[PDB]
């Protein structure tokens, strides 16, 4: 599951979290197994304008 979020919202991709993208964008179950991968993409997913 691939998406782009903020830097402070990477704590919300987790079981049992309260947050905004956890509730209304992407929810993980309490019995979730797998791995969450996050890396900075300011060189690619950002524009000066």
């Amino acid at each position: 599951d691939s998406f782009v979020i903020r830097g402070d919202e990477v704590r919300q991709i987790a079981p049992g979290q309260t947050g905004t993208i956890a509730d209304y964008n992407y929810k993980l179950p309490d019995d979730f197994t797998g791995c969450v991968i996050a890396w900075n993409s300011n060189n690619l997913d950002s524009k000066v304008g």
Partner: protein, 49 residues
Amino acid sequence: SALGKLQDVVNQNAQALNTLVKQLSSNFGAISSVLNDILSRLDPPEAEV
């Protein structure tokens, strides 16, 4: 005290039932002994614990 042998058995059974019912009032290290309070106060990840 003529009939102490039967009364002893009656007292032991009643005391065992009273102790078993009384043990529900103990939280056993949890925040509360009431299940409804835990289910209404906490999120399921910590309410599960």
